[PDB]
mmCIF file of C-alpha atoms in Angstrom:
data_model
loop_
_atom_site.group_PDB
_atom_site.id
_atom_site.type_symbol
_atom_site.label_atom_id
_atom_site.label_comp_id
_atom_site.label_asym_id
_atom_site.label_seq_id
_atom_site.Cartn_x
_atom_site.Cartn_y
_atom_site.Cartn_z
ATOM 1 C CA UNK A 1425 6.447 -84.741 -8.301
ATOM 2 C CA UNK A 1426 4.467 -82.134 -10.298
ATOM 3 C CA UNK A 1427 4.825 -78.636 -9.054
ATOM 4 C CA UNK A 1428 1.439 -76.619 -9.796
ATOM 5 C CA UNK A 1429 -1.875 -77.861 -8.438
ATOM 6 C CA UNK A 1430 -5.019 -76.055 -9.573
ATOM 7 C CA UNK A 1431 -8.718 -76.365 -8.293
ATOM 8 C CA UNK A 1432 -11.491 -74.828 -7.033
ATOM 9 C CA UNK A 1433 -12.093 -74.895 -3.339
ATOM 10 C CA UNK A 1434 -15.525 -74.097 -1.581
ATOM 11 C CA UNK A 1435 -16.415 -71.298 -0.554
ATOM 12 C CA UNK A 1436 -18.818 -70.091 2.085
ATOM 13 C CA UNK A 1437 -19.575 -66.801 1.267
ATOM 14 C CA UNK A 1438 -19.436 -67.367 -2.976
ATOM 15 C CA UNK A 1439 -19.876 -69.460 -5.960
ATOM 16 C CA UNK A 1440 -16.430 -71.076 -4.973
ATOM 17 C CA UNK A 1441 -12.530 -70.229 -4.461
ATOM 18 C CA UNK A 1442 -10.458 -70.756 -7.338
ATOM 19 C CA UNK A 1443 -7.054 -71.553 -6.004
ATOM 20 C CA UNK A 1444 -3.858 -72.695 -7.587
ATOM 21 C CA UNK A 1445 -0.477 -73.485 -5.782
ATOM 22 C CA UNK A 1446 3.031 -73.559 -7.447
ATOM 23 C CA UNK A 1447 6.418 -74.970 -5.443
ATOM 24 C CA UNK A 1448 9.285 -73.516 -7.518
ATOM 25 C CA UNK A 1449 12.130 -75.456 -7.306
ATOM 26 C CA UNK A 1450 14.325 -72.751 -5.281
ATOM 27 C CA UNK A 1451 12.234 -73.936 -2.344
ATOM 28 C CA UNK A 1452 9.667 -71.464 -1.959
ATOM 29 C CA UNK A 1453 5.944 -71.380 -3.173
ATOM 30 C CA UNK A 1454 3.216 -68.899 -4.073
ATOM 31 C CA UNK A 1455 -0.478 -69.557 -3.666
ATOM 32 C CA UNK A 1456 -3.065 -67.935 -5.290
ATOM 33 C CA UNK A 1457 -6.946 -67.384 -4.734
ATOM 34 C CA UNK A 1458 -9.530 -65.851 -6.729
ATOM 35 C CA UNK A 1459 -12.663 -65.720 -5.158
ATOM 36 C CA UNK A 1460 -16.031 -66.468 -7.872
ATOM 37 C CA UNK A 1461 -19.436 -64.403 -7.235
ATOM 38 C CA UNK A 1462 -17.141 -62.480 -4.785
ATOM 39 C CA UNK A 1463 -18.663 -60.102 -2.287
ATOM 40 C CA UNK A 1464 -15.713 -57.866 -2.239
ATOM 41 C CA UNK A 1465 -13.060 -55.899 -4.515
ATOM 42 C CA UNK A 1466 -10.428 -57.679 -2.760
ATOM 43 C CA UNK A 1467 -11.381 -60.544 -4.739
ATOM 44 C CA UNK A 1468 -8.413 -62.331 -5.472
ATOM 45 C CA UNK A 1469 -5.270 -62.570 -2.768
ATOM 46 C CA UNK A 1470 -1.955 -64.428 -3.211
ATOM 47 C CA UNK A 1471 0.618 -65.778 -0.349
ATOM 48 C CA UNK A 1472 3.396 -67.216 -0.462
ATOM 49 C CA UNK A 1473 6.379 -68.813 1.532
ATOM 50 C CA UNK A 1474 8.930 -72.096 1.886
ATOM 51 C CA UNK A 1475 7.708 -75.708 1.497
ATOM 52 C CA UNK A 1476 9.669 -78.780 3.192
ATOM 53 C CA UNK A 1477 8.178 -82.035 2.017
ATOM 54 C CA UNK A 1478 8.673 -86.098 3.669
ATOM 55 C CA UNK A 1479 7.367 -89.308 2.020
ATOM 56 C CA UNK A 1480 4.214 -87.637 0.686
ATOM 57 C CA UNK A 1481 3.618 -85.015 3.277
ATOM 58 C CA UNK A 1482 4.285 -81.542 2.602
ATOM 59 C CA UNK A 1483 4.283 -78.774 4.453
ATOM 60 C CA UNK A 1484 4.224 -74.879 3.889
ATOM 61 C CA UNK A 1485 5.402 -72.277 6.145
ATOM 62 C CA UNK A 1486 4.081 -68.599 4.823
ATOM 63 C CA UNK A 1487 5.851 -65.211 5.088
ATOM 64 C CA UNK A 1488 4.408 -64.783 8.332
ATOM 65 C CA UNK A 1489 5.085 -68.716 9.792
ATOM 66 C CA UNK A 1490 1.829 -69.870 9.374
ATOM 67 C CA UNK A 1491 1.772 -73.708 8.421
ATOM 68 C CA UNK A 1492 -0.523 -75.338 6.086
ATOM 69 C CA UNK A 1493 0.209 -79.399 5.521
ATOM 70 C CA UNK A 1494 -0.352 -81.070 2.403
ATOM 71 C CA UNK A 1495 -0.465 -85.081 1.275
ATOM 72 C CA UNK A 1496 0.365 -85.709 -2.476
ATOM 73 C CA UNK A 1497 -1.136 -88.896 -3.932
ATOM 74 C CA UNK A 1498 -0.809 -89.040 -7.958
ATOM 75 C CA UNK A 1499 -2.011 -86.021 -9.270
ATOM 76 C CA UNK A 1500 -4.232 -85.128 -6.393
ATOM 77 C CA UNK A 1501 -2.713 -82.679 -3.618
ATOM 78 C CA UNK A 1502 -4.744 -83.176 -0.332
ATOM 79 C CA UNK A 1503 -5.228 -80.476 2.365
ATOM 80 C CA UNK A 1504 -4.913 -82.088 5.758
ATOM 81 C CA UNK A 1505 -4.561 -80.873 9.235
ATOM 82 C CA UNK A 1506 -1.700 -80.956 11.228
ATOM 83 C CA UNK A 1507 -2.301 -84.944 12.212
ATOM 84 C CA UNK A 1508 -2.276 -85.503 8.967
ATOM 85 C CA UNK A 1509 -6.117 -86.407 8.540
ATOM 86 C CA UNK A 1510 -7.944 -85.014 5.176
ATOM 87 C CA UNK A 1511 -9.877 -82.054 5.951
ATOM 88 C CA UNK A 1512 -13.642 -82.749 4.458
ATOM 89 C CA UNK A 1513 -16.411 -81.411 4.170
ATOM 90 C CA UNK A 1514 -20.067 -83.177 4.276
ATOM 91 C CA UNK A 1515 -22.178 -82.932 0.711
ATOM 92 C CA UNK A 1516 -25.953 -82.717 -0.159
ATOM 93 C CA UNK A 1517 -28.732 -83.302 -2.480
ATOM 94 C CA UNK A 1518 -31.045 -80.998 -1.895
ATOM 95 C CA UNK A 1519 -33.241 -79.461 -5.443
ATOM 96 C CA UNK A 1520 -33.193 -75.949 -5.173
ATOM 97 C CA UNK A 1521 -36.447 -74.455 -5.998
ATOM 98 C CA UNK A 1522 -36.457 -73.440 -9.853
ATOM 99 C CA UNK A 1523 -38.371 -72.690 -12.485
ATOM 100 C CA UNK A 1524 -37.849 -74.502 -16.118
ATOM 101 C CA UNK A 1525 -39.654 -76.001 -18.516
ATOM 102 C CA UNK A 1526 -41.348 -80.069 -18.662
ATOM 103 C CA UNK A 1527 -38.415 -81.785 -19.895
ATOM 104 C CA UNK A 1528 -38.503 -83.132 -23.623
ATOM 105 C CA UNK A 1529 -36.567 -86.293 -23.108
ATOM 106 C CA UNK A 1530 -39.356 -89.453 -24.199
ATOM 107 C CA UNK A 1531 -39.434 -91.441 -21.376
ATOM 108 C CA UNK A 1532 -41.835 -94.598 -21.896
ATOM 109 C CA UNK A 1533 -45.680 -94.764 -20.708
ATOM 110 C CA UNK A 1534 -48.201 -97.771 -20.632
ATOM 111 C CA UNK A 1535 -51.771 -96.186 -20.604
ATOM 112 C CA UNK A 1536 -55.058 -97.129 -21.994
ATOM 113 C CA UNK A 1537 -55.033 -95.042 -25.623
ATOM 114 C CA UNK A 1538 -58.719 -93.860 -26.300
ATOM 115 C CA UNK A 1539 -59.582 -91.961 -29.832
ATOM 116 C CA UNK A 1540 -62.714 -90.768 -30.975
ATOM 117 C CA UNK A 1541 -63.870 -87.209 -32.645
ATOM 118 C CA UNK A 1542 -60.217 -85.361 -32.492
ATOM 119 C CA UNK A 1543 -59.498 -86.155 -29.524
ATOM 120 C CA UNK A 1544 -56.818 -88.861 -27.901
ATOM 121 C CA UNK A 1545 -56.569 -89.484 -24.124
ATOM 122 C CA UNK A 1546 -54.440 -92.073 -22.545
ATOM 123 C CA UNK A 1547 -55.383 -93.082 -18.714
ATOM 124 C CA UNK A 1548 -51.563 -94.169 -18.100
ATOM 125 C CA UNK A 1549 -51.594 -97.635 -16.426
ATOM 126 C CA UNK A 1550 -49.255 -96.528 -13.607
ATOM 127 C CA UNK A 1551 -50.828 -93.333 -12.169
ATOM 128 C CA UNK A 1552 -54.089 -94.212 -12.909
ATOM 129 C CA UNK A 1553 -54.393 -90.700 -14.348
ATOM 130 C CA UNK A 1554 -55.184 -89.474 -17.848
ATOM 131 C CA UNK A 1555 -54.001 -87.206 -19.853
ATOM 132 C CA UNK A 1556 -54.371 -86.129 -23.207
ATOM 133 C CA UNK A 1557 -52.304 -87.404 -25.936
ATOM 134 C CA UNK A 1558 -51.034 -85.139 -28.764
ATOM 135 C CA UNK A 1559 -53.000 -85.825 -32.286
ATOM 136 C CA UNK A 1560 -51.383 -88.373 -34.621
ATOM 137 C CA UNK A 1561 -52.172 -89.631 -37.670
ATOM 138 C CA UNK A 1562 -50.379 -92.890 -37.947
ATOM 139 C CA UNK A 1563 -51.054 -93.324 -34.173
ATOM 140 C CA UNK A 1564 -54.654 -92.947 -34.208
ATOM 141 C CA UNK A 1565 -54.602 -94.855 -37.320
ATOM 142 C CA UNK A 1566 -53.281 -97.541 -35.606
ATOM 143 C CA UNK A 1567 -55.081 -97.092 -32.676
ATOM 144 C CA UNK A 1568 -58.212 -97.604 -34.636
ATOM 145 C CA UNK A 1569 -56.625 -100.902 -36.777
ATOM 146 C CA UNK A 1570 -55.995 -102.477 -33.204
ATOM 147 C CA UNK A 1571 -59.412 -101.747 -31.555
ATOM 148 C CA UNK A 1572 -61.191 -103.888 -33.980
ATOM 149 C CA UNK A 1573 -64.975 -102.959 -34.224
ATOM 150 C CA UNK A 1574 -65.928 -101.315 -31.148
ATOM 151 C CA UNK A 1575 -65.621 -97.785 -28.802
ATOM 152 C CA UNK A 1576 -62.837 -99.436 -26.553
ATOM 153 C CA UNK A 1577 -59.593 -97.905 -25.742
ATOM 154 C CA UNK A 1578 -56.479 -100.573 -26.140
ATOM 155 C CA UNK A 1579 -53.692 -100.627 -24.029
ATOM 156 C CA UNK A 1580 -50.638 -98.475 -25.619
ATOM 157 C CA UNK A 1581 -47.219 -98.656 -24.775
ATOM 158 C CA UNK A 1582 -45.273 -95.375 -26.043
ATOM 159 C CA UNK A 1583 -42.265 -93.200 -25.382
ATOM 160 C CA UNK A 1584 -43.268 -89.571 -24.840
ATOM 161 C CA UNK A 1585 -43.016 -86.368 -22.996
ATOM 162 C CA UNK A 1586 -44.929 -83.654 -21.430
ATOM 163 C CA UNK A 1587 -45.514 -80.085 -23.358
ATOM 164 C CA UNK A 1588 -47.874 -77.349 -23.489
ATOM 165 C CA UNK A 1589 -50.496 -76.768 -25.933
ATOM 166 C CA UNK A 1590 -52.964 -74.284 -25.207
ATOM 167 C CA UNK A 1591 -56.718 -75.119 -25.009
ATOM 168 C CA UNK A 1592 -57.971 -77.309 -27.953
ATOM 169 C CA UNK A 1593 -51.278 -73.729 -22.121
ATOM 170 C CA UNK A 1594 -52.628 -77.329 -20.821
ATOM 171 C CA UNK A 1595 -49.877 -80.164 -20.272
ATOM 172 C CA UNK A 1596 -50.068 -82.715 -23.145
ATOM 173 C CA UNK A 1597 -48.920 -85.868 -23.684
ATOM 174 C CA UNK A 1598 -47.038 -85.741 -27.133
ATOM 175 C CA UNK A 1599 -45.351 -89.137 -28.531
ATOM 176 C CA UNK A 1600 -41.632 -89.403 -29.778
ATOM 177 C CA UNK A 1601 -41.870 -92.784 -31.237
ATOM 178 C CA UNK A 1602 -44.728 -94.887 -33.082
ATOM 179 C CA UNK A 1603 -47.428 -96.819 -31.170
ATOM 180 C CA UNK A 1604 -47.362 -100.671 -29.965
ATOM 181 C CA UNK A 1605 -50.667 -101.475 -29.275
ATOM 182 C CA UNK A 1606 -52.240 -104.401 -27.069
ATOM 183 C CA UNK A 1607 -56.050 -105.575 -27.624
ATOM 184 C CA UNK A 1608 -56.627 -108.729 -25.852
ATOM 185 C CA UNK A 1609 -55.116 -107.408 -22.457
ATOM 186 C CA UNK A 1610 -55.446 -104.210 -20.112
ATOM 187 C CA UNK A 1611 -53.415 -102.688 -17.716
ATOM 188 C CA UNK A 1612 -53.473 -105.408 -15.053
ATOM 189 C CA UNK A 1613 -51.371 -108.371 -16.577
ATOM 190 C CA UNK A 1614 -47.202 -108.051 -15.863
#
């Protein structure tokens, strides 16, 4: 059985506790904890005491008596109470309220691709909304080859992402990989 154990424990009042435990072999043990985004100057306090372990279980009596159990299981060292359950505590997903910028990962869109005098808009299949789409050469090219001879917009299926680009900052569509363009059918047709 390994004899240090490292980890950062949760904290309540801080960005976490940073502990680390280490059973020397002459029976005794010395904890330490170092507390992250600490609140105080006393940020960082170390114990120590004698440790008596069973199959797994292991227990640690301080320099004042105070007992602290513990169940080792590989690697991991688990902090239970006294009845030997895990202590736990419950997670969540909540987003925190942030401010960055739209993300430049392509992700792919299926809109209606319309081109005429500089200007591209694609009325994405999904949301029903349109947006405008970044100017392309080859794209529009394309766009245009697809189209055949007339003013209606073909059905486009493209990777892209969202970015700002002023007033021709408004949110524009702006493609990350070449077109794939549809004629015959529309939107409604899976």
């Amino acid at each position: 059985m390994p004899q240090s154990w490292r980890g950062v424990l949760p904290c309540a009042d801080c960005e976490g506790i940073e502990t680390s435990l280490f059973l020397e072999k002459d029976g005794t043990w010395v904890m330490n904890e170092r507390y992250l985004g600490a609140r105080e100057e006393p940020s960082s306090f170390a114990s120590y005491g004698t440790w008596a372990r069973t199959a797994d279980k292991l227990v640690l009596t301080d320099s004042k008596g105070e007992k602290s159990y513990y169940r080792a299981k590989g690697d991991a060292l688990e902090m239970l109470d006294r009845e030997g359950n895990p202590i736990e505590s419950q997670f969540n997903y909540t987003l925190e309220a942030a401010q960055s910028s739209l993300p430049m990962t392509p992700m792919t869109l299926r809109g209606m691709y319309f081109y005429m005098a500089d200007a591209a808009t694609f009325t994405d299949c999904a949301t029903g909304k349109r947006f405008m789409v970044a100017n392309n050469a080859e794209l529009e090219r394309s766009y245009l080859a697809a189209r055949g001879h007339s003013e209606k917009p073909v059905l486009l299926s493209v990777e892209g992402h969202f970015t700002l680009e002023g007033n021709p900052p408004t949110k524009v569509l702006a493609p990350d990989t070449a077109g794939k363009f549809y004629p015959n059918q529309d939107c409604s047709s899976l």
